[PDB]
């Protein structure tokens, strides 16, 4: 097809991500505002912006959930793992959770260059790797903007929801050695 | 890991490969510009001081040049990037040897071989520097001697 | 540090350290070889995206094989650092971030030498704003791949 | 200093054939992708042929100059060709020959321009 | 295959700030980082300005810029001079062939 040197073909593979299910976290998007990591053939995680809000109380009662452990442990790991990676997050008001009954489900209000919303925004666009910039309207520009006012991570079941990008681990593994490297004193 | 950062080429250059420092990248002094065969050490090797501060420049001035410059200095740009351009256990080994009274490497002055008429120069190595003092030529004589050796073999390696 | 996971060798081979990825593993393709020639740049260089996807496809198929758990990401989280460059998809993210071409690790190009079979070692194909670059934006980089083709061929 | 001399240019009759020449100082002229550049007088630039480095095996041209114009390089020598066969009258412009690099990790632009040699055809 | 849309001239006074449009497509412009511009002299080559959008060339002043949103790259010179009055040309990365260049720019320093 494409030759060079007369003797050389241009030849191409395209790795299949999806099968790597069993050992690690797989990101991917479905549209704009929907965006998922899938832990196995059965639970997963879905980061989705919307102007809808889905919780309206400001508190977190993560030692609750801790104790009642209800929660998948793989999910809680990844949560954790994002809000650690936030470089400078110093408004706890906007991070409000629901873990009743083991559904996980975090909110961050984007509403509250330097703001809250940029450091989320940061770790959402390393998170969900592939099909980030369609959300982001950024472009290249360390300031982050949406018209979005909240992102919403709720736990879900698998489908076939990678439609924009494929499913891949790189977005979750980066993320692992930025995890706790940027966090202010509490 | 390691630091995965390649060295961004100007356009004028004969070479693709060389490395060259502005007039304001180096302290009086005007620029210098090194050969191909001396920077390709920098992506092989781990150990050397001088390649971590390319690396340095280099993302500083991609940095500026590609981005549109910050309000008030972001750093989070750096923060995210330190180990993909520098080697940290690097600076961590001269940190021990300040410690342990050894001369060291402050990161400040380089010395290098040029010779006279082909005007190839070896990889800039770190002058060592002891109680606020740099170490005389006298005191590293048989560093350099080695590195006149590693020159004729490399020269010698391309005829 | 680095990566030290060494990519396990199958038992109907006919030289010790190629590496082939199945049917499963890729996307609209048959299963395909490489050999060990090209392989073994895995374990030297530090750069190569692709063979940072090899040790991750191998660990993966290596955990199947010999444990039961899907609760397995504590062992992904332990074992990361032996068989990625982290700082090299950083690089990607970098280049991402300054409107430069970027590898999303899912296409690869390779040269396939027409009559003796052989095979580089597989770059990425870099993306752009969505959409793959034509070769004509990378022709340069085939061509370099192509001369050190010859010279490991005479060798 | 970086340089590129074309030679070659001159009068021809519509129909007919020339050949353009471009040679390289003072680079590694193997490593870099060769292109063409017309200007037509008193018009703009208009990219006509380009050649990849080393084996010029990725060649491109212009849909108005398909099937009439052959890029060519001479590694040994250090020289890019041109042929021009069929001489159209709007053939007719400055050319200039103008090094890049076609790279994902390391690309260059045209940097490097030759003095342009001028083509005339008549009819 | 059609060029890009740039205006015929542009004129200012001197020291005055004037900028030169570079219109195209989705397929040119917009899918890449890699408009560049070239100064162009009466019987002179074309020279590097800027590349990759926003990158100076060696020696060109500080006085050049170079940006780009969506389908548009622009070239801005502040600080108008004698000096700057030539002819200037955009180009950039196309989907069907390596380059595409535009029609070209008449900057005029108004005496």
């Known amino acids: 097809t494409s030759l060079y040197k007369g003797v050389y073909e241009l030849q191409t593979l395209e790795l299949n991500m999806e099968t790597l299910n069993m050992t690690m976290p797989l990101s991917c998007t479905k549209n704009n505002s929907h965006h998922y990591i899938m832990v196995g053939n059965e639970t997963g995680l879905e980061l989705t912006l919307t102007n809808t809000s889905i919780i309206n109380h400001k508190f977190c009662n993560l030692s609750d959930a801790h104790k009642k452990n209800l929660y998948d442990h793989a999910l809680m790991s990844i949560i954790s793992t994002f809000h650690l990676s936030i470089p400078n997050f110093n408004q706890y008001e906007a991070m409000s959770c629901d873990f009743n009954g083991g559904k996980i489900s975090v909110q961050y209000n984007l509403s509250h260059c330097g703001t809250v919303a940029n450091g989320v925004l940061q770790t959402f666009m390393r998170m969900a790797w592939g099909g980030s910039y369609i959300a982001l309207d950024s472009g290249c520009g360390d300031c982050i903007m949406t018209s979005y006012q909240y992102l919403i991570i709720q736990n879900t079941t698998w489908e076939d929801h990678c439609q924009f990008s494929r499913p891949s681990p790189i977005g979750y593994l980066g993320l692992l050695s930025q995890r706790t490297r940027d966090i202010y004193i509490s | 890991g390691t630091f995965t950062w390649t060295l961004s080429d100007s356009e004028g250059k004969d070479t693709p490969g060389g490395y060259c420092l502005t007039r304001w990248m180096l302290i009086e002094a005007e620029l210098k510009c090194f050969g191909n065969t001396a920077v390709a050490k920098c992506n092989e090797k781990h150990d050397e001081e001088f390649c971590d501060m390319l690396r340095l420049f280099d993302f500083n001035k991609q940095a500026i040049q590609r981005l549109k410059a910050p309000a008030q200095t972001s750093i989070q740009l750096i923060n995210k990037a330190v180990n993909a351009l520098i080697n940290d256990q690097l600076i961590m080994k001269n940190h021990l040897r300040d410690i342990m009274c050894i001369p060291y490497c402050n990161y400040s002055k380089y010395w290098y071989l040029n010779h006279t008429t082909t005007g190839r120069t070896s990889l800039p190595k770190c002058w060592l520097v002891s109680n606020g003092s740099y170490l005389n030529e006298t005191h590293f004589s048989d560093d350099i001697e080695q590195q006149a050796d590693n020159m004729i073999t490399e020269m010698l390696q391309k005829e | 540090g680095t990566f030290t996971w060494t990519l396990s060798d199958s038992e109907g081979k006919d030289t010790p350290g190629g590496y082939c990825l199945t049917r499963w593993m890729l996307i609209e393709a048959e299963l395909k070889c490489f050999g060990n020639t090209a392989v073994a740049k895995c374990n030297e260089k530090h750069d190569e995206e692709f063979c940072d996807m090899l040790r991750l496809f191998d660990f993966n198929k290596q955990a199947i094989q010999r444990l039961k758990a899907q609760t397995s990401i504590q062992l992904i989280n332990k074992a990361v650092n032996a068989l990625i460059n982290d700082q090299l998809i950083m690089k990607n993210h970098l280049r991402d971030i300054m409107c430069i071409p970027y590898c999303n690790y899912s296409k690869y190009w390779y040269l396939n030498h027409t009559t003796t079979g052989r095979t580089s070692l597989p770059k990425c194909w870099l993306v752009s704003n969505g959409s793959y670059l034509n070769e004509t934006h990378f022709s340069d980089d085939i061509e370099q791949q192509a001369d050190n083709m010859i010279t490991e061929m005479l060798q | 200093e970086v340089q590129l001399v074309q030679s070659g240019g001159g009068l021809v009759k519509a129909g007919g054939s020339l050949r353009l020449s471009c040679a390289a100082s003072?680079?590694?002229?193997?490593?870099?992708?060769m292109n063409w550049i017309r200007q037509a007088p008193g018009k703009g630039l208009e990219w006509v042929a380009s050649?990849?480095?080393?084996?010029?095996?990725?060649?491109n041209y212009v849909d108005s100059v398909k099937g009439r114009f052959t890029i060519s390089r001479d590694n040994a020598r250090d020289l890019l060709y041109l042929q021009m066969n069929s001489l159209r009258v709007d053939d007719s412009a400055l050319y200039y020959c103008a090094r890049d690099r076609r790279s994902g990790t390391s690309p260059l632009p045209l940097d490097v321009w030759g003095q342009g040699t001028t083509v005339t055809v008549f009819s | 295959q059609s060029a890009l849309t740039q205006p015929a001239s542009v004129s200012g006074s001197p020291g005055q700030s004037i900028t030169i449009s570079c219109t195209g497509t989705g397929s040119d412009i917009g899918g890449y980082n890699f408009v560049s511009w070239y100064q162009q002299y009466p019987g002179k080559a074309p020279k590097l300005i800027i590349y990759?959008?926003?990158i100076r060339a060696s020696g060109v002043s500080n006085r050049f810029s170079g940006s780009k949103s969506g389908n548009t790259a622009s070239l801005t010179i502040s600080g108008l001079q004698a000096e700057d009055e030539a002819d200037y040309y955009c180009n950039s990365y196309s989907i069907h062939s390596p380059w595409v260049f535009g029609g070209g720019t008449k900057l005029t320093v108004l005496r």
């Open positions: 003072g680079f590694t002229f193997s490593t870099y992708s």
């Open positions: 050649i990849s480095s080393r084996s010029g095996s990725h060649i």
């Open positions: 990759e959008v926003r």
